[PDB]
Each structure stands twice: as structure tokens, then as C-alpha cells.
């Protein structure tokens, strides 16, 4: 094929942008076969693990770091041409701000589960109440925001509980078939062993391979080429009749919410670290001394301590005995420019970050008069469209969760075999930003009514409002 | 693995940013085993303690210092190229401001405990009333804000009281299993012995290792490699059937509220110390004297005391007897620039700090007219999302507290063995910023009613309002 | 351990910041033992006293001075490079302003004591009325504001009165056990003897060591290494069954309210003293006279008194008899810059001081229109959170006061042995800033009623309002 809109940088000069945007970083893994072939030919799994280690894990790592505030500006060894001038570093926390806002719009209110058979409904509610599923769903949505994807594993634990756990996206992937249906063949979890040991022994990983009938356990290391060798507990069955890892996705491309704005965040870091360097280097402006002079650096240091500099020219003497002195001059050299004129540029960057994410931008400043909020109405529209796409993909993930749950309940006789969970309806309620005074006024201008008890429950200065209605009647 | 978005600085040139953001600083400790193996192979505990001492304790130390106002700008040995010019140092107290605001939003009102069995409810309330649990919860929330995590230990004391104490996060950690469930295997508390003794004897620590059945006590020192040796009171049982330290976390990453803005705070310190240095160095501008001159520094000091400087050139004489004088010149050299044009930059920094934290920004200045407060509505939304995540993790911590309490009550016959505390519901009420006049007007515009007694209890100028209703009827 | 975010300055070049922020200045003293061991091994008490004298007392001293307006800017020997130029010094009284505001918010209204047994209530009220406890509590709160901690001692005096006195925080400390419960083992008060004597005899201190059963009295001096030797009244019993000094704390860290802003206050002092120096040195600008000239300083003084300066060049004569005069020049040299452009910087500093403390900032200037006060609402929220933490610690201190009082009443038969004071409830009422006209209007807009008598007691122009109601009826 042609090279079309692709990097050509040397592989040693790659940075974050290379790891984020190169074409291998975000591919879906497919296998032209079935699990029975793949589970014999375990050699192929080593290829998938190596490709993950070398291409996908870097991208996810970068994203993770930005969520934590560990940007490019902090970790670069040098970002300046000048060795001895100021080298201020700074990181701006946009990514966290964005993700939290979006995820709170999406799952600030729990998903409501409803169905026409109460036995399924109460089995669902029991499973949810065991596992704190409300918080599990919020943390899935957060990971979708950060990485573009999330994974959950369902297990039966030592107490014979059916339990659900989020699996770290940096160490988890799924292999699919090559069909247009994309059925999942196998799940992989790989973890660093000896994570805390010193003195740089070869890096050993423990690998779980999850399959439609069980899980297989191996050890491997990079220096042997990720060739798998079994652990003692080499295999363990599970009663789920499908591979028990479910992958959720943020959108069809599996893109995160802030990923497409990272380069802006980088600019915004540079802009500020440039201003800081400007301030400090001006104070430390280099002193330039011109002319033929007999000044040792220690002599200059002594004169600077005295706050008086003497520049004494050398005297040249002709063969005719004429004496003439040389020239001397001295002063600070520094760059000066209208730094204030950069501020509008900084404004622009900031607003662009917010505009592409649909996140609130307006200054927390003293401002007088009413505001129609006209831009925020269109931001909330733009946010709702992306949230509705996310909701569709999320309900697909929940449907698969329900089928796994149903199977583990049937194959352990916790439910009748005629119960099919696929009729459950998942109801979502958006969490909008609201101020209670505006809402109350708009409600009462619109002819709404409220009981005294509830009105008193909106305002906290009623220390115990059940008494207040009585005290009111005592005044009447 | 590849080095991806990582520091490459020399280990001797590390500073705060290295200690905060390097990949080892915030790892969760896991052990591939059980407590019965670990408690025989006590050698491994020395590895965990050493890794804490070398990687995690520095990060927590840095955070702690910022909470206290001990920033990078104060402790650096030199921050300037110029030895003899001004070296103003300054620290801005943002971190405390942020933490206090957030924690007061979260636990300004106590958690309400409720359950369908009153015997559990009154056992809970008795335990809470003994231990001042309201203040214990507030100080946990504060530590979550500062460090990202907090620890509490439950004990039976000499008076046979069941007591609950917060354990210092800089000296406490937990080791978990390598399972996806992350069960806690062992707790570690390590404290400096001889903290006040002079003359630099080797640093000795006393180590408590907490286990599912008791606590084991050791001494150790850095110069032997943290090898543990038992104390006299080498072991003590406890009636809790689980390891009795519970770890709370602020969020899934265990990140503090201000940690991601520290580098901004550093910039804001530099900006101000640069302005201060600008002012003072301009006053002390170096005097530059050019030309061939016979001025001793004592002679210059005398002339400066007289406020008149005489620059007398030397005279050069030719072989033809011609006399010509040399050149002389004198003046101040200083840097000058539009400092006022930096102010907007300082504004930006300030606002960014507030914006990433969701903390109020607007100037405490004279300002006329009504304000809709539109930005604060979105800040309170953004704050509520993070608080709701914190609440979920906090209720998990409280559930474990309840199971420990229940076990210690059963195994000392303070409760019936059929009482299971896991049905308790924890109710949270957010503490919003409010002004009572706005709330009262919005309530009364909305058709609310208030008794005279309560209305008079909102306004303090009623010196004793129980009399006022009578005096009012005496006027009618 | 690593050095992490720590000073490296030479011990002779330490200043205020070193004394405030170094890691030893604010440690809690613990002893791994019991009072019976410590009271035999009185050698250890000398170690604690020496560590207090060398590390904690300097910090408290600095804080104390700032409360009094004795800042760094006043006491520095030189703050300028120029010996003979102006050296204006200034101190800004922020610390007092802050402390008074905060303490008046907290204890402007007395704590109300209430209990379900009136015998305890009246014993409490009698003890409070004897000791002016309202003012004692206000002065404790003030010390908490200044130092971060406060101490009170309870005694039986010569008149057999039970009396309560605040103990100076610069000369008082407590030693705790090494348990997680931190029980107090011993209290120390040490006072300078011969405080007024001249001619520099060795500094002798008198030391009181307070213990669970009595107080032990010693003398000591720095030149012997603080080795204690008994006084004549070497011991005295007390009927309290606990060590009778109680320590209150402002917050978990024992930090004062203005301590974290001290460095800002320093900047604000420098900024103003720089402006003052700018003004005066411009007037006294040095006169620079260039060229070869025969001017004695007395001759220059005479010419300056005449207000005419004559600069007469010397004449050089060639061997060919040619005469040529030298050059001369004269003028003022001074630094000039836009001082007005520093004002915004001064604004910033001021506001930051107020913002970190939650203290009112807005200018006392002519300003037109209504103000919503929006920033002050969030400042009062931020202040309330810190006050609520302080209240929790204060009630712990009062509970210990109550147990001491109860014990001294029982062991002198002033109360029945079945009275247990631990049921007392302490009620706090916040003192908010209010203007009575705003409150009155908001009350009456809200349907409140007031008797004529009380309304006339709000307004002072009623010279004797008991007559006014009669005169009103005489008009009707």
C-alpha cells in the first residue's frame, strides 16, 4: 500500500504522539480459527501478547499518565536549547476534569433494571446488591472515558459467591474470530511477577488465558520471546458456557474523551512554562563585559559583592612611546517582548479544549446581570449525542453480563431453566447540572405545587422540619 | 518494556516531581501466597518495608509538606544564578484551602446510620458515641484529601474498651494477595525509636506486623538491611478474626485532591518571588565605572558617603611630551521591563488552580448588581461527581468497620450471634454553601411558611425569643 | 532516609523560615515507658527540655513576635547592598487582624453547658462563675489561633479554691506515651529565674514536673547541660488522679491560623519598604562629576551652598607650547521606573493573604449600588469548616477538664460519688457578622413580628423606651 498520512520518524526519535496515533496502537485482534485450534497452537497467543506489549500498552500508558497529571512537559529530559537558564516544568489537569464531568453526566444516577418476570428482577437485584454494582458501573464508565474501553471478569470465588470485578485495561485484551459477527474466542490477562524485587532479574509475567470452558495458567518472560510454560495450577474449569471476560467500548473507534485534545494540553503546558522562563531569565540577565581587561572571575565576584564595577582599559604603547588606552563597555543583555499579547492565545487554547470536549468553559468571576447560557445549551446537546452512543454500547455489555449471570445461576440450580434474562429493560436517567433555586422558581412560575414537608426538605436551615409543621399550626 | 513517558534524570538530580510522579511511588503491594507463608518467611516483609521507605514515603512526605505550606520554593538551596542579588522566597497556601473546602463539603454533616434491627443500631450508636466517630470520620476524609488514602486500626485497650484510631499514612501500609479480589494479608506499622536523641546513632525502627490472629513486634535498622528481630512482647492475640487495619481510598488511583495541581502552585510561587526580586534589585542597581582611574573601594565608599563622585582620568604623556587625558564614564546598570504585563499571567495560574479543583475563585471585591453565579453551578456539579465516587469507597470502608465491630462484640458476648450488621444503611447529606437570607427569600417566594419561634431563631438580635411571642401577644 | 524537600542551609545562616518549617519544630513528644520509670530516670526529662529549648521554642517565639507586629523586616541588621542610601523598615499587622477575626467568630458567644442532672449542671456553673470561664475560653481560642495549641493547669489554691489558669505555650509541654492512644505521662513548666538581673550571670531556670500524683520542683542551668537539682519544696501532692495539665490543639497538625501566610506578609513588607527607598534615594541622587578637576569636598560644599557649580578643566601644555584644555561633565545619576506598575502586585499579595485565611478583603471605599456579597458567602463557608474541626478538638479538651473537676470535687466531698460528668453536652453558637438594618428588613419581609418594646430596644434614639409606649397610648 501507499504511505498515506503516516509518520516517518526514526524509531529511536518516537515520542508520545507516535505511541498514541500510529496505526498499530488500537487494532482489534482477530483469529481465523476456533478456540480448539488456538488452544492447541498456543504459540499464536505469544504473538498477540507481544503485539500488545509493543503497540497497545504504550498508548494506554500515555493516556493513563495524562489522567494522573503526568504530561510530556514534566518527563522530557531537556526542553530547552540553553543549559544554564531556567527550566520551569508544568502540567495542566484538563484530562481529569473532562473525564469526571462526562462520567458524572452519564452515571450520576444508577441504571434502573426492570422486567416482566419478578424472579429475574430479584435475581438481578440480589446480584447487584452483593457486588455494589452501582459503583462497578461508575468505574467502568470512568475507564471508558480514559481508555476508550473497559473489561470486566465474572468469577465464582472461594465462598461460592458469584462475583464481578473490573480488569485493568493495560493488561487485558480479547481475541476475536475473523467473522463479521466478531465472536470472542479467548481472553488474556498478563501480570508482572516479582514487581518489587531489586537488582534487575529478567522480567517474568504470569499469564491467564480464559476460554469457553476454563482458564489456563502460564509463566513467561521477554528474553525467551514470550514462550508460555504452564504453572502448577495449569487449568481450572468454570461453569460459564462462554468466555467470561466482557469488553465495553466508549465508541466504535474505542477512543477516549480527552485523547483527541492531548496535543492542545501540551501546547498549554509549553505556553505557561515559556512565560515562567521569561520572567526568571530576565532577572538573571547575563552581564556582558567588552574590552581588553584584567578581570578574574573571583575579582568580578568581589566587585559585585561591593556593588561597584571598575572597567579599567589596558594601555598600549607605541615604539614612539605614545600611550593610548583601549575601549571598554558593560551591560545586561536580555530578550524583551510584550508578554501580555500572548494572553489571548492562551485564552484560545483553553476554550478549544473545552469546546471539543463539550465541557463548561466560562470564567468563575464576578459578573453582573442575568445570563441566557446560550452556548451551554448547545454544549449539553453535543454531550447528549455522545452519551446516547455510549449508552447503546453499554446496554450491549450489560446484555452479555446478564447471559453470563443466567448461565451460572442455571448450572448451579439457583434459578429455573425456563427463566431467560434477555427480556430485561435497562432505564437510564441523565444527571443534568442544576441549581435548586432556578429549578424551584421555574417550577412555581409554571403552576407547580409542593408540600410544606418537601419544601422544607430542600432548605437545610430547618433543623428538624417534622416539628415545624406542628409549630406552624400552633401559630394558627 | 519500552520507556514510555518516563523520567531519565540522574538519580542525584531528582526533585519533588520525581518523587511524586515516578512509577513506583503509588503501587499496591501484593503477595502471591497466604499469611501462613508470609509469617514464616518474614524476610519478605523487609522487602516491602524497604520499598515503602524508598519510594512511597517520599511522595507522601512531599504531599504532607505542601499541606503545611512547606513548598519547593522555600527549601531549595539556591534558585538564582546571582549570588549577591536578592533571593526572596515565598509559599502559597493553596493546598490547605482546597482540602478544607472539599472535606467540608463531604463531611460537614455527620453520616446517619440506620437499620431495621434496633439492637444493631444501638450497638453502632454506642460504639460511635464512645469514640467521637463524627470527628474520626472528618479526619479520615481530610487524610483522603491530602494523601489519597487513609488507615484506621481497631483495638481492645487496657480498660477493655473497643477503640478506633486513625493510623498515620506515612508509616502504615497493607500487603494484599495476588487475587483479583485483593484480600488483605498483613498490615505494617513502623515507627522511629529514639526520635529525640542527639549525636547520630544508627536509626532504629520498631515494627508491628498485624495478622488475622494477632500482632507480632520487632526492632530493625537501616544499616543491617531492615532485618527484623523480635521485641520482648514478641506477640499478642486479638479477637478480631480478620487483619484489623482498614484502608480507605480517595479514588481508584489513590490520588489526592491537590496533588495534580502542585506544579502550578510552584509556578505561582516563582512568579511572585520573581517580582519581589525585580523590585529590590532595581533599588540596589550595580554602579558601573568605566575608564582608567585610581579609586580604591574605601575611597569610593567615602565619596558615596559625601554623595559626590569624582571620576578623574589619568594623563598619558608622549615622548614628544604631549599630554592627553583618558576617558571616563559612570552610571547604574539595571534591567527594566513592564512588570504590570505579567499580572494577567498570574491571574491565569490562580484561576487554573481553582478550576481543576472545583473550588471557588471569584474576587472578594466591591461588586455591584446581582450575579447568577453561573460558573459556580458547574463547579458544584463537578465537585459532586468526585464526592459521589468518594462516598462509594467510604461506605466500603465502613462496611468492613462494621464487620470487625460485629466480630469483636460476638467473641466477647456483647451481642447475640444472630445479629448480622451487613444490613446497615449509611445516609449522607451534602453540606452546600448557603447564605441564609437568599435561602429564606427563595423559600418564602415559594410559598413556604415558618413559625415565629423558628424565624426568630434564624436572627440573633432576639436576645431571648421565648419572651418575644408573649410580648407580641401583649401588643395584641 | 533520603533528604526530601528539606533545608540544606548552613546552621549559622538560618533565619525565621528555618525555625518555622524545619522538621523538629513541631514534633509530639513520646516516651516508651510509664511515669514510674520516667520519674526515677529524671535524666530523660533533661533531654526533652533541651529539645524544646532548641527546636520548639524558636518557632513559637517567631509566631508570638508576628502577633505583636515584630516582623523580619524590622530586626534584620541590613537588608540592602547600599550602606549609605535609605533603609526604611516597615511591619504590617496582618497576623493580629486574622487571629482576632477568627477567634471572634468562634467564641464571640459563650459555650452553653447543659446536662440531664442539675447537680452536675450547677457544679459546672459554679466552677465557671468563680473562674470567669467565658474569658478563659476566649483566651484559649486566641492562643490556639496564634500558636496552634494551648495549655491549661487546674490547681487548689491557698484559699482552698479550685482554680483554672492558662499556661504560657512557650514554656509548657507534655510528654506522651508511645501508645496509639497517646496518654499523657508528664507535664513540664520551666521559667527563667532572675529575669531582671544585670551583668550576665549564668541563666538559671526553675522547673515544675507535673505527674499523676503530684508536682516535683527543680532548678537547672544551660551551662551544666540542664541537669535538674531539687528545690527545697521538692514535692507537693495534688488530689487530681491524673496529670493536671490539659493541652488543646487548633487542628491535627497544631498549626496556627496565620503561620502558613507569614512569607506573604514578609513580601508585603519588602514591597513597601522598596517603594519608600525608591522615593527617598531619588531625592538624594548622587552627583557625578567627570573630568580632571581641582575640587576639594569643602570647595564643593561651598559652591553647593552658593547654588552654582563651576567645573574648570585643567590645561595641558605640549613641548611645542600648545595649550589644550581637558573635558568636564556633571549630573545626577539615579534609577527611574514606573513604580505605579507595581501596585497591582501589591493588590495580589494583599488579597492572597485574605483568601488563604478566609478573612474579609474588600476595600473600605465609597461604592455605589447593592452588592450580593457572593465571595463572602464562600469565605464564611470555608471558615465554618475549620471552625467545626476546632470545635471538635475543643470539646475533647473540655471533657478532660470536666473529669478533672469531677475528681477534685469527689476527693474533697463536694459532690456525691455517683455523679459522673461525662454526660454533659456542650452547645456552640456561631457569631456571624451582621448589620441590624439588613437583618431587620429581611426578617420583616419574611413575615416576622416584633413587639414595640424590643423594636425600640434595637434603636438607641429612644432615651427611655418604657415611657414611650405610654406616650404613644396618650396619643391614642
Amino acid at each position: 500500500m501507499l504511505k498515506v498520512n503516516e509518520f516517518e520518524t526514526d524509531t529511536d526519535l518516537r515520542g508520545n504522539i507516535n505511541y498514541l496515533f500510529n496505526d498499530e496502537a488500537n487494532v482489534v485482534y482477530t483469529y481465523d480459527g476456533t478456540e480448539s485450534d488456538l488452544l492447541q497452537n498456543v504459540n499464536e497467543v505469544s504473538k498477540y501478547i507481544e503485539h500488545h506489549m509493543d503497540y497497545q500498552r504504550p498508548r494506554l500508558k500515555v493516556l493513563s499518565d495524562y489522567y494522573e497529571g503526568k504530561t510530556k512537559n514534566l518527563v522530557e529530559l531537556t526542553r530547552r536549547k540553553e543549559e544554564y537558564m531556567a527550566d520551569n516544568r508544568v502540567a495542566h489537569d484538563y484530562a481529569s476534569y473532562i473525564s469526571d464531568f462526562i462520567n458524572g453526566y452519564f452515571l450520576g444516577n444508577p441504571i434502573q433494571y426492570q422486567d416482566d418476570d419478578k424472579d429475574v428482577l430479584e435475581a438481578i437485584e440480589a446480584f447487584n446488591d452483593l457486588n455494589d454494582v452501582e459503583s462497578h458501573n461508575r468505574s467502568l464508565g470512568l475507564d471508558l472515558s480514559i481508555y476508550g474501553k473497559a473489561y470486566e471478569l465474572m468469577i465464582r470465588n472461594q465462598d461460592d459467591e458469584t462475583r464481578l470485578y473490573k480488569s485493568d485495561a493495560m493488561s487485558t485484551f480479547i481475541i476475536y474470530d475473523n467473522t463479521v459477527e466478531r465472536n470472542s474466542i479467548a481472553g488474556v490477562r498478563y501480570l508482572r511477577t516479582k514487581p518489587i524485587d531489586k537488582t534487575d532479574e529478567d522480567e517474568v509475567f504470569t499469564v491467564d488465558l480464559f476460554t469457553s470452558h476454563g482458564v489456563y495458567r502460564y509463566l513467561t518472560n521477554r528474553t525467551n520471546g514470550l514462550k508460555l510454560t504452564p504453572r502448577e495450577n495449569s487449568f481450572e474449569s468454570h461453569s460459564f458456557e462462554r468466555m467470561p471476560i466482557t469488553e465495553f467500548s466508549n465508541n466504535e473507534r474505542r477512543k477516549g474523551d480527552y485523547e483527541k485534545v492531548i496535543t492542545l494540553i501540551d501546547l498549554y503546558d509549553n505556553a505557561e512554562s515559556d512565560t515562567a522562563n521569561y520572567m526568571s531569565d530576565l532577572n538573571d540577565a547575563m552581564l556582558l563585559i567588552k574590552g581588553n581587561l584584567n578581570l578574574d572571575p573571583v575579582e568580578v565576584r568581589k566587585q559585585k559583592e561591593a556593588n561597584v564595577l571598575f572597567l579599567e582599559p589596558t594601555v598600549y604603547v607605541d615604539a614612539e612611546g605614545r600611550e593610548t588606552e583601549g575601549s571598554v563597555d558593560g551591560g545586561y543583555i536580555y530578550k524583551q517582548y510584550d508578554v501580555q499579547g500572548t494572553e489571548a492565545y492562551k485564552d484560545r487554547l483553553n476554550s478549544d479544549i473545552h469546546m471539543f470536549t463539550n465541557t463548561p468553559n466560562m470564567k468563575d468571576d464576578n459578573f453582573s446581570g442575568t445570563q441566557s447560557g446560550e452556548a451551554m445549551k448547545y454544549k449539553l446537546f453535543g454531550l447528549e449525542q455522545r452519551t446516547k452512543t455510549k449508552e447503546g454500547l453499554f446496554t450491549k455489555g450489560l446484555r452479555r453480563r446478564a447471559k453470563l449471570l443466567e448461565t451460572i445461576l442455571k448450572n448451579t440450580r439457583s434459578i429455573d431453566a425456563n427463566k431467560d434474562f434477555n427480556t430485561v429493560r435497562y432505564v437510564y436517567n441523565r444527571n443534568l447540572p442544576k441549581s435548586l433555586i432556578e429549578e424551584l422558581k421555574a417550577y412555581i412560575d409554571s403552576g407547580g405545587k409542593i408540600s410544606q414537608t418537601t419544601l422544607m426538605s430542600l432548605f437545610s436551615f430547618f433543623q428538624d422540619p417534622e416539628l415545624e409543621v406542628k409549630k406552624i399550626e400552633e401559630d394558627e
Side-chain angles (χ1 to χ4, degrees), chain A residues 193-390:
Chain A
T193 73
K194 295 175 171 169
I196 287 151
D197 291 350
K198 302 181 300 187
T199 319
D200 197 27
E201 182 168 54
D202 302 44
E203 188 160 38
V204 175
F205 299 92
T206 185
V207 176
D208 302 348
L209 201 183
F210 294 82
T211 299
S212 194
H213 304 294
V215 64
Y216 299 82
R217 289 187 268 244
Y218 311 92
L219 300 179
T220 196
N221 53 293
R222 184 61 179 219
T223 48
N224 86 358
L226 298 311
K227 299 175 185 177
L228 292 317
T229 62
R231 284 187 77 151
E232 263 276 62
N233 300 321
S234 185
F235 172 78
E236 174 175 12
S237 303
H238 61 56
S239 304
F240 317 100
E241 298 182 357
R242 288 180 178 81
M243 195 280 291
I245 302 178
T246 303
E247 178 182 358
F248 291 65
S249 62
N250 194 39
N251 44 59
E252 174 172 328
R253 323 295 279 223
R254 292 148 280 111
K255 252 51 170 56
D257 299 325
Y258 65 77
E259 179 182 1
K260 311 177 195 181
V261 303
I262 290 169
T263 78
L264 304 172
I265 299 171
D266 301 327
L267 294 192
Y268 201 89
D269 291 344
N270 297 356
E272 293 297 60
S273 48
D274 297 352
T275 319
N277 291 350
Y278 178 87
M279 300 181 70
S280 54
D281 291 338
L282 197 150
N283 285 358
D284 296 351
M286 213 163 308
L287 182 68
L288 185 73
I289 298 176
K290 292 188 290 175
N292 206 53
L293 278 148
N294 304 134
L295 282 172
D296 285 330
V298 176
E299 179 61 23
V300 171
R301 286 171 70 238
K302 286 179 174 180
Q303 287 189 25
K304 289 171 68 180
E305 188 179 42
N307 217 43
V308 185
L309 269 168
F310 305 94
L311 305 188
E312 299 168 37
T314 58
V315 188
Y316 307 120
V317 65
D318 297 353
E320 299 195 39
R322 298 180 60 255
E323 283 182 349
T324 56
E325 64 180 24
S327 185
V328 292
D329 212 359
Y332 305 117
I333 73 165
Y334 57 99
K335 328 92 185 183
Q336 186 177 168
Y337 87 113
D338 185 27
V339 306
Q340 166 71 64
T342 86
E343 298 163 18
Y345 165 66
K346 306 171 186 186
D347 283 343
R348 185 170 294 291
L349 293 165
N350 179 66
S351 66
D352 303 338
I353 306 156
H354 299 124
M355 196 58 76
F356 305 133
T357 76
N358 306 293
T359 70
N361 191 72
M362 78 212 306
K363 310 299 186 63
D364 189 27
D365 279 330
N366 290 309
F367 194 83
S368 57
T370 188
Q371 308 199 44
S372 77
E374 210 66 34
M376 276 301 311
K377 158 183 169 182
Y378 296 109
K379 286 192 169 183
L380 291 170
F381 183 86
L383 175 64
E384 180 50 37
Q385 313 320 303
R386 291 177 175 162
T387 308
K388 190 64 180 175
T389 299
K390 198 201 308 179

Side-chain angles (χ1 to χ4, degrees), chain A residues 41-75:
Chain A
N41 192 13
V42 175
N43 316 292
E44 305 297 338
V45 180
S46 77
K47 299 177 180 172
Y48 293 101
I49 296 174
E50 185 187 20
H51 192 277
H52 198 271
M53 284 184 177
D54 289 5
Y55 292 104
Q56 302 216 341
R57 206 188 201 268
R59 171 176 171 278
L60 301 170
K61 203 285 175 178
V62 177
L63 299 161
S64 193
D65 293 355
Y66 280 62
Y67 189 78
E68 302 183 12
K70 184 179 177 164
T71 70
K72 182 179 186 278
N73 193 284
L74 305 189
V75 293

Side-chain angles (χ1 to χ4, degrees), chain A residues 10 42 105 118 132 139 167 193 197 249 360 374 388 395 434:
Chain A
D10 299 286
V42 175
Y105 176 79
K118 288 188 177 183
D132 290 311
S139 82
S167 188
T193 73
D197 291 350
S249 62
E374 210 66 34
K388 190 64 180 175
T395 47
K434 294 295 179 188

